[PDB]
Design a protein around this nucleic acid. Structure first.
Ligand SMILES: [Mg+2]
Ligand SMILES: [Mg+2]
Ligand SMILES: [Mg+2]
Ligand SMILES: [Mg+2]
Ligand SMILES: [Mg+2]
Ligand SMILES: [Mg+2]
Ligand SMILES: [Mg+2]
Ligand SMILES: [Mg+2]
Ligand SMILES: [Mg+2]
Ligand SMILES: [Mg+2]
Ligand SMILES: [Mg+2]
Ligand SMILES: [Mg+2]
Ligand SMILES: [Mg+2]
Ligand SMILES: [Mg+2]
Ligand SMILES: [Mg+2]
Ligand SMILES: [Mg+2]
Ligand SMILES: [Mg+2]
Ligand SMILES: [Mg+2]
Ligand SMILES: [Mg+2]
Ligand SMILES: [Mg+2]
Ligand SMILES: [Mg+2]
Ligand SMILES: [Mg+2]
Ligand SMILES: [Mg+2]
Ligand SMILES: [Mg+2]
Ligand SMILES: [Mg+2]
Ligand SMILES: [Mg+2]
Ligand SMILES: [Mg+2]
Ligand SMILES: [Mg+2]
Ligand SMILES: [Mg+2]
Ligand SMILES: [Mg+2]
Ligand SMILES: [Mg+2]
Ligand SMILES: [Mg+2]
Ligand SMILES: [Mg+2]
Ligand SMILES: [Mg+2]
Ligand SMILES: [Mg+2]
Ligand SMILES: [Mg+2]
Ligand SMILES: [Mg+2]
Ligand SMILES: [Mg+2]
Ligand SMILES: [Mg+2]
Ligand SMILES: [Mg+2]
Ligand SMILES: [Mg+2]
Ligand SMILES: [Mg+2]
Ligand SMILES: [Mg+2]
Ligand SMILES: [Mg+2]
Ligand SMILES: [Mg+2]
Ligand SMILES: [Mg+2]
Ligand SMILES: [Mg+2]
Ligand SMILES: [Mg+2]
Ligand SMILES: [Mg+2]
Ligand SMILES: [Mg+2]
Ligand SMILES: [Mg+2]
Ligand SMILES: [Mg+2]
Ligand SMILES: [Mg+2]
Ligand SMILES: [Mg+2]
Ligand SMILES: [Mg+2]
Lengths: 227, 122, 95, 46
RNA sequence: AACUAAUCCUAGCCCUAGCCCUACACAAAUAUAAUUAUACUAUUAUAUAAAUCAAAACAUUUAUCCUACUAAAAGUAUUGGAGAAAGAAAUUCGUACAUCUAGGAGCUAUAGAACUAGUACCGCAAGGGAAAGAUGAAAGACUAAUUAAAAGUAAGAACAAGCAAAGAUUAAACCUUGUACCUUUUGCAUAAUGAACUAACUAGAAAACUUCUAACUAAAAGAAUUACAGCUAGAAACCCCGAAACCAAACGAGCUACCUAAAAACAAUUUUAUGAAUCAACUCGUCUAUGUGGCAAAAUAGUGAGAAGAUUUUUAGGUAGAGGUGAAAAGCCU
RNA sequence: UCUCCAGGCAUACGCGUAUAACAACUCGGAUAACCAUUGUUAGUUAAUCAGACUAUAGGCAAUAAUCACACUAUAAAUCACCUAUAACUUCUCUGUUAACCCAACACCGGAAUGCCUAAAGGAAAGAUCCAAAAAGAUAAAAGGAACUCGGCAAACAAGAACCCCGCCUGUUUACCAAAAACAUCACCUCUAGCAUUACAAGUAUUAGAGGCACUGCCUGCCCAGUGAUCACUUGUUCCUAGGGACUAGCAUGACGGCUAAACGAGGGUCCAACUGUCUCUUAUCUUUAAUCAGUGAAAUUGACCUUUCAGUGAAGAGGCUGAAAUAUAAUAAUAAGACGAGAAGACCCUAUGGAGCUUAAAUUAUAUAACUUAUCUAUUUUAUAGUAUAAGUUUGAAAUUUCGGUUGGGGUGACC
């Protein structure tokens, strides 16, 4: 009987109503423990492909205007509404974004490095080595999947041929083609980790249930004596 | 503790449960939640004029009842259709193609009163 | 044992008896001696001789062995060249 | 607490849990009806 | 000198024989929360049966269950922790009652079907599942009689002293004699189990060997078998009630545990700006007494804890036993 | 008409004629009156209260609520309007009663929301009597915890301090345990680099699993040794006792006493006040009790014409031995005996009877996870990729089965 709420087919900026799970599969059995309740929330669709040219428009760099920087219940970072041409869409907001700023989305792998301003999206090859980045994309055209959390940044360690080495926040190095976009700058809410929950009731608001009350080297035959 | 044996009707259950007692519909419900009666859906009683009629509910005990002979398809055919065909056959002006001349109907479509499937009540 | 079998309704023979004893038609039973093939190196020459013999059975053992076999094993057999031909009968027995 | 009152009647629940449409929804439920027909029960379902 | 009661005979049923079937029951309604005259929204059994149980335990294994013509070959060949047990075929034999639409050394209201009925009633559900009737040819003859007849009572309470009776006696009681019954214990009970009384119901079953009675006899038997007096036939036999468990398939979250969706309640006062304070509504249940077949299969009377929050409450939906749920009590799942 | 008491009226859910009149007086109400019972006849009226109620295809949404202004905050928070197509006057159907539902019952129990607090709704005593014991309330001379396991209970009191444990508000064994146990903010360890059904429309400041009071404060040491960024001695490796290579892109840790104010139907200690707890009990009223009228159960029961003392006996005699006593029956009381009745009440032992749990018991284990060899495709010049299956090996989630005997019951020993 369970039907997923993620059924909308068309992008929009209007908030969408969410249904909670409780940690239960579509069968109806618990699969993840510690989930339940919390405040009602609305989903705002985030577009993670920064360089999406508008309809019936050629693929060259374009600019957009920052309308708002807003709090989001569904993430640790904060989001910004940005408008360009005749289209509006949500995106992630960098550390120092302010309302009214203009930002650039580029498709040009400059033969020489392109001067980088926080928040603009460029192919990884253009940026100079050592420049912090976030919202990294593993494959060209896939959409950002890494380093999209609050206060987290990656580093472009090296570039050889058409492949670059990125240092993820965990410090595990990774490699990708140089034709996949990335946006410069650290993610917002640098001080997220400093929060103090304070009282048990606050965790219940976030949708977390309490833990449960309930409270291997086999020796070889010559090791049995001194076990 | 519920009664399994008594009939399920609309007097029982919560408010949102309703059903009919067997009366036929006389109209349609549109959106905007408005009922719209249709005149042709309301049955019309065809009542004859009873002035000067000699028949009454009861019959005299001295009236002789007759031997029962239910009507059959054979009897109807002989009384109505057989005489005309016999005369024409003697004259020779008979053919299978023109059975409609004697009252045969190839199909029931187009008739107001169709004999199968019946499209009228008693 | 089976006094009444499902398929035929008869008694059944215990086949472990048939593999160990011989029945003479008079009613005697013959057997070997337990251990007559085991650890011969540690047995004296007189002890080994006693083991090689064929021996008779007691009255109570004969009674039990009769119950555990059917009549087919108790009939008269006429084998040409039988080496037990002379032991199927009793002679000069007052009893 | 005092027991003995576990039946809190509700017609919507009763018809959904044990009703005719519910019994016919699965093959196991259809066999429930067949057994009660062979016994001769006057009441096949709720 | 009679009350309560008792007497009764047929409703039907049981096992065989025979035979395939062609029964598929006015109008209307019903798969929707069945029995609601018309569109929304599609519809569909199952991979090998297991365990109990026997082997005096249990682990390979255990007839029927899991069907393929009778009689014989034969409990033979073969298989088997070679042990409990299991077990063929080749090859012989057979037209069978054959209108037997019929039969009974079968039951007669606690019997025979559970049945007057799968009803009443019990359970949320799957499911479990009763009791009983009696005149005569005629009731358009007022419902018939028949029986010192069960226990229980009445007619009619009792009269020093004793397992309640026996020997007696002119005399009912007085005198004499006398440690209730069954089972179990050491052959013993003032030991300890069991029994208020009446009526009906309620528990030893098989033919290998032996003994007895007959037929025929070096042969017996109505085909297949046994025989150095045998062989054929008859008669003669081995109980009842009672677990905790184990496995297969259904049915259950209207109680309770947790979750999803849509809704709802919170006075007055002091603080502040809150899982703060005092204290109603409401939710819970510290301590004492009463109650103990109770008003109640967990209550009542007082007294107590929280009471804007991890609060309480309503409606509908979800998770199912090799499982679910759990602020873990091995708690809860009618 | 009078005396006294103080949750009532509607809706939802549920129930299904219990509704009203007449007639009956059998059964039902635990008794009468009267009916809630039996029979017969009647009843609830809606385009507004309530339910059900099918035109189609496209395009599109940054800005809570709380008197919403000011005002901030954090847990981030209820179809409309347009563009075209099509149709072009309508009221049928169903709910509506009641003293009512879930609890075996006319059950001192449970039951959501709105309005209101007496203008609505009701009756604690069948008649009589004033004993014991039992239950509940109120008053008490002088004394004031001397009571008791304990100030339990009660009081003209309802206040103060200190110790143990746990930080705090919360949760738990429905029906013998509410706590010092569980959870909890804080702190710490382990695993994981990724998309279209959970985690999550999320991405290392994230997610899952687990442990544990916090806070500060002492105790902090497996860096290779000595020289001193430098040389030897070590160590680890090779090439042959010789010869090379490597060890300068780093650098310890493990306890205690702490508590910290607050908080608690938690477990103790103490002072003051207070009192019938006690010295030492008494008086009154209500319920019960007793007598009259009506209706009318339960455990229990071998038969009983059912006595005391000494002796005998299985710690044991109404019934046996020896003595003694002794007209017959009811009503109200006490609890020594009838090893008094119901105990699903507990301790000890046995059975080739069971079940739950733990493993390092035996036997298996295509749960997963790995490999290997074939098979089937790709390539490759043999060769590396993969793999609807078969055979091996490695892990073990699980599965079935068992718990020798004599030595008091154990504990070490033994023993067959
Ligand atoms: Mg824990
Ligand atoms: Mg019930
Ligand atoms: Mg066995
Ligand atoms: Mg054959
Ligand atoms: Mg009968
Ligand atoms: Mg019967
Ligand atoms: Mg009598
Ligand atoms: Mg006498
Ligand atoms: Mg005893
Ligand atoms: Mg008894
Ligand atoms: Mg009798
Ligand atoms: Mg529920
Ligand atoms: Mg409920
Ligand atoms: Mg308030
Ligand atoms: Mg509780
Ligand atoms: Mg408090
Ligand atoms: Mg309070
Ligand atoms: Mg509060
Ligand atoms: Mg525990
Ligand atoms: Mg325990
Ligand atoms: Mg139960
Ligand atoms: Mg009335
Ligand atoms: Mg009257
Ligand atoms: Mg009435
Ligand atoms: Mg309306
Ligand atoms: Mg609709
Ligand atoms: Mg009304
Ligand atoms: Mg009850
Ligand atoms: Mg009662
Ligand atoms: Mg009034
Ligand atoms: Mg009185
Ligand atoms: Mg007082
Ligand atoms: Mg005083
Ligand atoms: Mg004292
Ligand atoms: Mg004292
Ligand atoms: Mg007290
Ligand atoms: Mg605590
Ligand atoms: Mg508390
Ligand atoms: Mg809970
Ligand atoms: Mg309890
Ligand atoms: Mg408490
Ligand atoms: Mg308690
Ligand atoms: Mg704890
Ligand atoms: Mg406490
Ligand atoms: Mg003092
Ligand atoms: Mg009386
Ligand atoms: Mg006497
Ligand atoms: Mg004595
Ligand atoms: Mg005496
Ligand atoms: Mg006594
Ligand atoms: Mg008494
Ligand atoms: Mg006793
Ligand atoms: Mg034994
Ligand atoms: Mg056993
Ligand atoms: Mg067993």
């Amino acid at each position: 009987k369970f039907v997923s709420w993620k059924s909308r087919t068309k992008y929009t900026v209007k908030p969408v109503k969410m249904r909670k799970s409780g940690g239960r599969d579509h069968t109806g059995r618990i699969r993840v423990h510690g989930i339940g309740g919390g405040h009602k929330q609305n989903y705002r669709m985030i577009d993670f492909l920064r360089f999406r040219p508008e309809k019936e428009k050629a693929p060259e760099p374009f600019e957009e205007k920052v309308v708002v920087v807003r709090y989001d219940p569904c993430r640790s970072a904060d989001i910004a509404l940005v408008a360009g041409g005749s289209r509006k869409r949500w995106i992630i907001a960098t550390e120092n974004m302010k309302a009214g700023d203009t930002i650039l989305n580029s498709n040009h792998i400059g033969r020489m490095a392109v001067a980088a301003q926080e928040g603009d999206a460029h192919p990884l090859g253009a940026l100079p080595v050592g420049t912090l980045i976030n919202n990294v994309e593993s494959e060209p055209g896939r959409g950002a999947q890494y380093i999209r959390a609050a206060g987290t940044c990656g580093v472009l360690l090296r570039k050889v041929n058409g492949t670059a080495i990125i240092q993820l926040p965990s410090k595990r190095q990774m490699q990708v083609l140089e034709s996949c976009t990335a946006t410069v700058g650290r993610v917002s809410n640098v001080n997220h980790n400093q929060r103090v929950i304070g009282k048990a009731g606050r965790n219940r608001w976030l949708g977390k249930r309490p833990n449960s009350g309930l409270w291997k080297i086999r020796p070889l035959p010559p090791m049995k004596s001194y076990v | 503790g519920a009664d399994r044996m008594s009939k399920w009707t609309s007097k029982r259950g919560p408010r949102t449960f309703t059903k009919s007692r067997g009366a036929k519909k006389t109209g349609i419900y549109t959106s905007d939640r408005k009922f719209v009666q249709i005149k042709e859906m309301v049955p019309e009683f065809v009542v004859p004029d009873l002035t000067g009629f000699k028949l009454k509910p009861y019959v005299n005990y001295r009236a002789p009842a007759g031997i029962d002979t239910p009507l059959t398809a054979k009897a109807l055919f002989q009384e109505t259709v057989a005489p005309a065909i016999e005369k024409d056959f003697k004259e020779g002006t008979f053919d299978a193609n023109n059975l409609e001349k004697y009252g045969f109907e190839p199909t029931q479509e187009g008739k107001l009163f169709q004999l199968y499937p019946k499209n009228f009540p008693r | 044992l089976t006094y009444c079998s499902t398929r035929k309704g008869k008694r059944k023979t215990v086949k472990s008896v048939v593999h160990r004893f011989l029945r003479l038609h008079s009613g005697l039973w013959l057997r070997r001696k337990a251990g007559y093939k085991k650890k011969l190196w540690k047995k004296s020459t007189a002890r080994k001789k006693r083991l090689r013999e064929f021996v008779f059975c007691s009255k109570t053992q004969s009674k039990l062995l009769d119950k555990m076999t059917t009549s087919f094993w108790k009939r008269r057999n006429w084998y040409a060249g039988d080496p037990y031909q002379m032991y199927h009968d009793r002679t000069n027995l007052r009893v | 607490r005092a027991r003995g009152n576990e039946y809190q009647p509700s017609n919507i629940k009763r018809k959904h849990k044990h009703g005719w449409v519910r019994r016919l929804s699965t093959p196991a439920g259809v066999q429930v009806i067949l057994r009660r027909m062979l016994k001769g029960r006057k009441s096949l379902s709720h």
